[PDB]
mmCIF file of C-alpha atoms in Angstrom:
data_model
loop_
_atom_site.group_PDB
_atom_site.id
_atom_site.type_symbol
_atom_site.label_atom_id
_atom_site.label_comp_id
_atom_site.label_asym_id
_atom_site.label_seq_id
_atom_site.Cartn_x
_atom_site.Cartn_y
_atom_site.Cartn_z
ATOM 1 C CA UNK A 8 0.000 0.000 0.000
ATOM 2 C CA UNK A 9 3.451 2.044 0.370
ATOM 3 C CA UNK A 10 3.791 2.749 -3.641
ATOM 4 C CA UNK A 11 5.366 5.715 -5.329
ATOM 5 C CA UNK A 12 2.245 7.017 -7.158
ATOM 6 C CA UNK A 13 -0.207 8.166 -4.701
ATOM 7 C CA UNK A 14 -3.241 7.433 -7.747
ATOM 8 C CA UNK A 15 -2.023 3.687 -6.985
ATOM 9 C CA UNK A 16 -1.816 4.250 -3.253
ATOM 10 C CA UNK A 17 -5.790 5.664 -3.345
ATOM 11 C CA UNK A 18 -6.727 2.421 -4.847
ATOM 12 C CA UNK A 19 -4.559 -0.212 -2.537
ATOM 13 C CA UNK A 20 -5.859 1.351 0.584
ATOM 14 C CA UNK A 21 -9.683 0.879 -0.304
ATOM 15 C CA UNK A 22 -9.092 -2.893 -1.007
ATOM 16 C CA UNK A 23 -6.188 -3.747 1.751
ATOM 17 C CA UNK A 24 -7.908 -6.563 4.074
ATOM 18 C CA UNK A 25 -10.990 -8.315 3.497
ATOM 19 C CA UNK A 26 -14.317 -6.756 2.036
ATOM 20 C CA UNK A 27 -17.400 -7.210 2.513
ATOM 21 C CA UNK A 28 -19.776 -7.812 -0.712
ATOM 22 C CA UNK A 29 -23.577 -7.187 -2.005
ATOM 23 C CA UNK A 30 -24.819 -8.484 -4.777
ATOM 24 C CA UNK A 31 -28.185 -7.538 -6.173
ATOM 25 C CA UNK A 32 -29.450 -9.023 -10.285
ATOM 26 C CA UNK A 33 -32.857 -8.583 -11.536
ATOM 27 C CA UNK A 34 -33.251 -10.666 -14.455
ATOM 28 C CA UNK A 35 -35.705 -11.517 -17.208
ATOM 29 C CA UNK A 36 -34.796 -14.365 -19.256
ATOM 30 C CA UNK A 37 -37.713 -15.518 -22.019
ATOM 31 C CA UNK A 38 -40.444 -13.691 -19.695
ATOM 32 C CA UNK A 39 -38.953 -15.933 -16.518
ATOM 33 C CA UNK A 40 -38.571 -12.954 -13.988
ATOM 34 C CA UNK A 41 -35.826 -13.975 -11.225
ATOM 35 C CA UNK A 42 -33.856 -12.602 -8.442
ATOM 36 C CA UNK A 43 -30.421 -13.524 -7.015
ATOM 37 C CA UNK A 44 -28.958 -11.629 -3.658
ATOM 38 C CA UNK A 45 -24.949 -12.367 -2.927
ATOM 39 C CA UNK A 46 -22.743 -12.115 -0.141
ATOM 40 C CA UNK A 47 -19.655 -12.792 0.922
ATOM 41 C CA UNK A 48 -15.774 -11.431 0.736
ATOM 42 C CA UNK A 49 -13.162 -10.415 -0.900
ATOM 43 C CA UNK A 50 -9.222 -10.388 -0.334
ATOM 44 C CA UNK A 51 -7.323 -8.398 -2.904
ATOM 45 C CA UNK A 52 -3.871 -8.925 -1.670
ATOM 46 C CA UNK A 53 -4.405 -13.054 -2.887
ATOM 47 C CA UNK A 54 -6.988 -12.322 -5.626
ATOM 48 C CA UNK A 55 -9.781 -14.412 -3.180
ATOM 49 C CA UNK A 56 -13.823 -13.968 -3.564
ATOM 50 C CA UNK A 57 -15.810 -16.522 -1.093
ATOM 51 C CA UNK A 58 -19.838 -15.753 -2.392
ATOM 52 C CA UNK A 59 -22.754 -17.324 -1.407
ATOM 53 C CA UNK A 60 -26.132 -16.550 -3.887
ATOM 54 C CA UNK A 61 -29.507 -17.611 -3.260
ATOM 55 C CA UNK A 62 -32.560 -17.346 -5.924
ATOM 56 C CA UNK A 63 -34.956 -15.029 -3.972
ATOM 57 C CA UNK A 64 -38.168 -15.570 -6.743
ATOM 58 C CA UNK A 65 -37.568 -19.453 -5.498
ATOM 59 C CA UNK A 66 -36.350 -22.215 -8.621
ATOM 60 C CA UNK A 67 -33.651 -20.034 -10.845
ATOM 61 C CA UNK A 68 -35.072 -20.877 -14.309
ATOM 62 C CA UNK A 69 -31.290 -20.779 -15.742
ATOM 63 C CA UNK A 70 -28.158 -23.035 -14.545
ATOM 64 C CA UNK A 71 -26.390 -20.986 -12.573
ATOM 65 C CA UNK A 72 -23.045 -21.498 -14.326
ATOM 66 C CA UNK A 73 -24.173 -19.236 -16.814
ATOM 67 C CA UNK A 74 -24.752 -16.246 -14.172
ATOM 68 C CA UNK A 75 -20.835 -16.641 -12.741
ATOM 69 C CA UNK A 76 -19.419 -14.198 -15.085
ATOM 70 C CA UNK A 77 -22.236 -11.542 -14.463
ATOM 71 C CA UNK A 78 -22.569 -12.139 -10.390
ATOM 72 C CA UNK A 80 -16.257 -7.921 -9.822
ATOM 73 C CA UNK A 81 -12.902 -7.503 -10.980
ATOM 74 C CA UNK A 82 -11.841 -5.425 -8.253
ATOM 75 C CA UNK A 83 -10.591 -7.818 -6.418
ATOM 76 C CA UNK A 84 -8.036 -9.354 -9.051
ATOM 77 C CA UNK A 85 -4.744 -9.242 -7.632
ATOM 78 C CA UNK A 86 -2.168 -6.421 -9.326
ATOM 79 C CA UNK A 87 1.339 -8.121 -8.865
ATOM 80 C CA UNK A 88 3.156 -4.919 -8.029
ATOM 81 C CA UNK A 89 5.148 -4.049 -11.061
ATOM 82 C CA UNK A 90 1.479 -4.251 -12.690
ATOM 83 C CA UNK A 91 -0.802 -1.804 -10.317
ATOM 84 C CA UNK A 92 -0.591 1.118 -12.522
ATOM 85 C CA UNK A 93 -2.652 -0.966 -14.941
ATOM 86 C CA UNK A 94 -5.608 -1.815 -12.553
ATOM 87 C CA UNK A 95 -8.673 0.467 -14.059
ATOM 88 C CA UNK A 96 -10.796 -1.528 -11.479
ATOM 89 C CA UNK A 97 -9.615 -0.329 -8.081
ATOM 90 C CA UNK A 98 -8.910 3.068 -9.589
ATOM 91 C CA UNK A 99 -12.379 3.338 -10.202
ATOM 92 C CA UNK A 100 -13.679 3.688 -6.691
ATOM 93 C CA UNK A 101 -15.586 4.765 -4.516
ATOM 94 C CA UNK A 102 -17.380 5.921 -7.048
ATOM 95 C CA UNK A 103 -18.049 3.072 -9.036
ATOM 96 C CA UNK A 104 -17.829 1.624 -12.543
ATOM 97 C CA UNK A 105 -20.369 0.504 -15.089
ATOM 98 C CA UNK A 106 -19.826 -2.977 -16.461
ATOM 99 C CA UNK A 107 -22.111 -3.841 -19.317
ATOM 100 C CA UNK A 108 -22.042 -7.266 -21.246
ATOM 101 C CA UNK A 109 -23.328 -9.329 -23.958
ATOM 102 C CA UNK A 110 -23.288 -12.663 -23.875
ATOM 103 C CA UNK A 111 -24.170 -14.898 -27.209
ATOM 104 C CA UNK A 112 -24.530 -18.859 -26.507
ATOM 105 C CA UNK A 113 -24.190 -20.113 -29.440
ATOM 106 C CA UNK A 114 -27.072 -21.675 -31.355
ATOM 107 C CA UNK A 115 -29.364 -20.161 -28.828
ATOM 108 C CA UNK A 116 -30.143 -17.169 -26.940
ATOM 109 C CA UNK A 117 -28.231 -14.258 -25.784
ATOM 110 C CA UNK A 118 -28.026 -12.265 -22.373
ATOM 111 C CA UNK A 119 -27.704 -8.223 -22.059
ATOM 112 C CA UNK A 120 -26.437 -6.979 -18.917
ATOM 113 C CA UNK A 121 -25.406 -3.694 -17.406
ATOM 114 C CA UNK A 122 -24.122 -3.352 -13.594
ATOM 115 C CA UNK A 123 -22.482 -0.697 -11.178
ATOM 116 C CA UNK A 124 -19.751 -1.684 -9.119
ATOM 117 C CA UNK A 125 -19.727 0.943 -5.979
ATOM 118 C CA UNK A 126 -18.881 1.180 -2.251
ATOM 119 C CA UNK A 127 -22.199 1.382 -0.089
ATOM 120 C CA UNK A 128 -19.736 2.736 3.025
ATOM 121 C CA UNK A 129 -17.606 -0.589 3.823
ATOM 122 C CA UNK A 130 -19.393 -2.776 1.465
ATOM 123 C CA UNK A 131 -18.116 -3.330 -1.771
ATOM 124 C CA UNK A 132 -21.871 -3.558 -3.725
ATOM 125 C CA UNK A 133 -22.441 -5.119 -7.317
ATOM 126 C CA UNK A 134 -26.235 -4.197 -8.308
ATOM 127 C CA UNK A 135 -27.062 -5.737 -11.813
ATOM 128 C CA UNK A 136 -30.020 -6.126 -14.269
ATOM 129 C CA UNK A 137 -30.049 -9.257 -16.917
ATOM 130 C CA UNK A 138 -32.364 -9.349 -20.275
ATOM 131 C CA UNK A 139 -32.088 -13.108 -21.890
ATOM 132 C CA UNK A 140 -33.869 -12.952 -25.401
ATOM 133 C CA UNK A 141 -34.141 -15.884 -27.809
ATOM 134 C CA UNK A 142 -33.669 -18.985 -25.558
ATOM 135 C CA UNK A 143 -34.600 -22.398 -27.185
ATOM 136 C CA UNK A 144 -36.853 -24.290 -24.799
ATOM 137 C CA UNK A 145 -35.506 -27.742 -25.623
ATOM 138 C CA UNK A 146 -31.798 -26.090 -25.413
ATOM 139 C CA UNK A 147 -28.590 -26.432 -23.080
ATOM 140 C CA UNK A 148 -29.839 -23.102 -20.933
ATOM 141 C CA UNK A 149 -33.772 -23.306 -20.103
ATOM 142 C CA UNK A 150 -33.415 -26.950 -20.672
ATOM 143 C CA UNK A 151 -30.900 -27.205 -17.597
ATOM 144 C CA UNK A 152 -28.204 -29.533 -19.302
ATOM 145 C CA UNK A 153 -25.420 -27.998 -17.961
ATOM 146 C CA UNK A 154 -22.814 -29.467 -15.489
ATOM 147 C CA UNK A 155 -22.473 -27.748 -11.987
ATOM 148 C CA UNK A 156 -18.678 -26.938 -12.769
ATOM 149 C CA UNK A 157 -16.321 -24.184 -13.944
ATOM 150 C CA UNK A 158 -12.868 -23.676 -15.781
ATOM 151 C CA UNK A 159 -10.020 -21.719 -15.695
ATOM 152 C CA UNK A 160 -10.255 -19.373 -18.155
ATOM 153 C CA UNK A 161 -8.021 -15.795 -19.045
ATOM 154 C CA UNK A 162 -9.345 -12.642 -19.997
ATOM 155 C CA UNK A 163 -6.949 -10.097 -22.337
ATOM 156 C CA UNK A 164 -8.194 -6.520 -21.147
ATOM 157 C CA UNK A 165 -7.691 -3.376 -23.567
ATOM 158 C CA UNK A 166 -7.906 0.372 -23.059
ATOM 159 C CA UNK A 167 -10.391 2.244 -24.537
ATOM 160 C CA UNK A 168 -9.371 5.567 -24.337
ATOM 161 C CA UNK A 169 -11.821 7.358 -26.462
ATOM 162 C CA UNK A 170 -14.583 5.638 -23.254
ATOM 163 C CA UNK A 171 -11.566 6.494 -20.503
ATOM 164 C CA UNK A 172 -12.881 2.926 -19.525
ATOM 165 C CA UNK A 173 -11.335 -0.907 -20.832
ATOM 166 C CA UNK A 174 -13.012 -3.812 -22.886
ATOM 167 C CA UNK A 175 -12.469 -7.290 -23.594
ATOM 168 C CA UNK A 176 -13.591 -9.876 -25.509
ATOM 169 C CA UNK A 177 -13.478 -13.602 -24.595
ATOM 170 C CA UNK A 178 -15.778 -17.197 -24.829
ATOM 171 C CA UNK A 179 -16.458 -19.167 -21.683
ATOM 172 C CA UNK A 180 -17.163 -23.346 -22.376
ATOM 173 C CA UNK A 181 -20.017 -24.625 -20.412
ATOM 174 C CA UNK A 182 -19.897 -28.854 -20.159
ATOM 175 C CA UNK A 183 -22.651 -30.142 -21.022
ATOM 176 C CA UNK A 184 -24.163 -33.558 -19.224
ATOM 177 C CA UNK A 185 -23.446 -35.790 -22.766
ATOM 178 C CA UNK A 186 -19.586 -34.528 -22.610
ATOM 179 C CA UNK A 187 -20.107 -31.883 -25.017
ATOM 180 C CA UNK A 188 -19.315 -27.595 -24.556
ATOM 181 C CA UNK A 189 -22.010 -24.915 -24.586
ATOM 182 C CA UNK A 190 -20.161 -22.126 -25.903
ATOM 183 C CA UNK A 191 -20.738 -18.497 -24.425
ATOM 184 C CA UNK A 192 -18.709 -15.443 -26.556
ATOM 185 C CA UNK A 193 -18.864 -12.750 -24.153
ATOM 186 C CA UNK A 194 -18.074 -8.485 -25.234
ATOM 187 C CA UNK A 195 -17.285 -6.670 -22.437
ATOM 188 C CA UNK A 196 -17.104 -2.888 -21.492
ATOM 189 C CA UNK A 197 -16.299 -0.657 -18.213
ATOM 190 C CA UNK A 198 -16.859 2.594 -17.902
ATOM 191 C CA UNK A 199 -16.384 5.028 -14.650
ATOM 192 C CA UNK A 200 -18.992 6.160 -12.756
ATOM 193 C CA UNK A 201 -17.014 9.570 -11.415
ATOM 194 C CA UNK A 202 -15.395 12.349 -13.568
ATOM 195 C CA UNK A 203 -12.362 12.084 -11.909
ATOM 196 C CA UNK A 204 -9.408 10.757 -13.602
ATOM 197 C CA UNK A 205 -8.757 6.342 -13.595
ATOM 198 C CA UNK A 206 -5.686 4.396 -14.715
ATOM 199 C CA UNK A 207 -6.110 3.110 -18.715
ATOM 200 C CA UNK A 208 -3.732 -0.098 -18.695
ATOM 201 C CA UNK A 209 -1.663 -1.278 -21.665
ATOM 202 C CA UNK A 210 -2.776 -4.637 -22.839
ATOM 203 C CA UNK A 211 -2.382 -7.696 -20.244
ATOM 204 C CA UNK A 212 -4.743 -10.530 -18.836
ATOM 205 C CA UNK A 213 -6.625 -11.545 -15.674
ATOM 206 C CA UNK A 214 -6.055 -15.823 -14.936
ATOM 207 C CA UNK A 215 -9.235 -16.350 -13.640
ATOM 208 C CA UNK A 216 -9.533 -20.098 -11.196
ATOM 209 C CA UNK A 217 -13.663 -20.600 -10.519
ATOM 210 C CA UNK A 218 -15.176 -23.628 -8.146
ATOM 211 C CA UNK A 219 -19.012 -23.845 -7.300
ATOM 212 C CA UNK A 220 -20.154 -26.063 -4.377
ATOM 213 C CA UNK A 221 -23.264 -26.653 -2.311
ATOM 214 C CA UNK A 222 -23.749 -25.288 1.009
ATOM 215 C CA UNK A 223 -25.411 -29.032 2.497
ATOM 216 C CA UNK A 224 -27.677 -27.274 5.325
ATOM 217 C CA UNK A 225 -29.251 -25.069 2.168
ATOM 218 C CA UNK A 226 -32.879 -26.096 0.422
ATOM 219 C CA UNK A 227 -32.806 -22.541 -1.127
ATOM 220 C CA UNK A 228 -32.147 -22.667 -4.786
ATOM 221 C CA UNK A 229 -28.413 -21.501 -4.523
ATOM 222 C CA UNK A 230 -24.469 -21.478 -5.566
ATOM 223 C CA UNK A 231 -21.166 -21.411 -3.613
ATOM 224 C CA UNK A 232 -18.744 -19.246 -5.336
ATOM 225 C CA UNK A 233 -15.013 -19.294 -4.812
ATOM 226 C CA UNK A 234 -12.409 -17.300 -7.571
ATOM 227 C CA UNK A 235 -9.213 -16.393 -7.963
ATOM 228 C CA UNK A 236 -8.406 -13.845 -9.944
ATOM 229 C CA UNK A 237 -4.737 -12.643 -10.845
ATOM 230 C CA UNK A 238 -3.693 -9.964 -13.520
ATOM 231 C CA UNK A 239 -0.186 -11.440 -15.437
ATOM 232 C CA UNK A 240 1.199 -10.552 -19.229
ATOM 233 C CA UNK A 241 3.613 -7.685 -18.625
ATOM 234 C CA UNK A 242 7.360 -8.482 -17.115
ATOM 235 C CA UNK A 243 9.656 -7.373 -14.478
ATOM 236 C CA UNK A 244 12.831 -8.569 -15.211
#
């Protein structure tokens, strides 16, 4: 949290020790209206996010693998030679906007738009979801895919002309028979505040994903724990 730019130093000091975090989607997927609420932590210094979920409207009528990507990238861990490059963290309090499509291919495709602010301590992700042209026989409404994730990296680029970052990248979903559900996912962030935010040159986030069950739960529900760590530019 000692660094030599005090932009960097800002950013560090919000997200040194563990945070607290909300999250809050409203989704609509084929005219299924549903409702997830999140909590748990997050630990910057080790890239760490510990999340429990629980579908509020009662049976989620998606598999929640397809919701991880949409239920905060603040809490990647910057290797230090790196944490000029972290828009995220530079970003806050005041927020970001992260807004998404999401294309399965051969069926439907979700739309999604969230703000990533501080609520005082707690680190808050509030999100809406629109699904449009789901197949009701497919992988997604049909429920055929496994409860299981992959690693999976991310290349982020600047866009200046935004003062905010996209990427572009596809998720594979197993499906039951052994086959992938492909997801192509096109990201962008934007800041919430006027004040100024760290553009990074090109690198990646290694994200490391593993959903569980909480035994004791009969709410409709996912146990979320990441890792996410930022690499692709060198020391020496």
């Amino acid at each position: 949290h000692h660094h030599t730019d005090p932009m960097v130093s800002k950013g560090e000091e919000l997200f040194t020790g563990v945070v607290p975090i909300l999250v809050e989607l409203d989704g609509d997927v084929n005219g299924h209206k549903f409702s997830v609420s999140g909590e748990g932590e997050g630990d910057a210094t080790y890239g760490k996010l510990t999340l429990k979920f629980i579908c509020t409207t009662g049976k989620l009528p998606v598999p929640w693998p397809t919701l991880v990507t949409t239920l905060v990238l603040c809490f990647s861990r910057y290797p230090d030679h790196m944490k000029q490059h972290d828009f995220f963290k530079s970003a806050m309090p005041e927020g970001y906007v992260q807004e998404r499509t999401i294309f399965f291919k051969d069926d439907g495709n979700y739309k999604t738009r969230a703000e990533v602010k501080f609520e005082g301590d707690t680190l808050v992700n509030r999100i809406e979801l629109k699904g449009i042209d789901f197949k009701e026989d497919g992988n997604i409404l049909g429920h055929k895919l496994e409860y299981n994730y992959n690693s999976h990296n991310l290349y982020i680029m600047a866009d200046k002309q935004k003062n905010g970052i996209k990427s572009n990248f596809k998720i594979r979903h197993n499906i039951e028979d052994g086959s992938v559900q492909l997801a192509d996912h096109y990201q962008q962030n934007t800041p919430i505040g006027d004040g100024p935010v760290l553009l990074p040159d090109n690198h990646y986030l290694s994200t490391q994903s593993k959903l569980s069950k909480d035994p004791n739960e009969k709410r409709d529900h996912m146990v979320l724990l990441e890792f996410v760590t930022a690499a692709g530019i060198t020391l020496g």
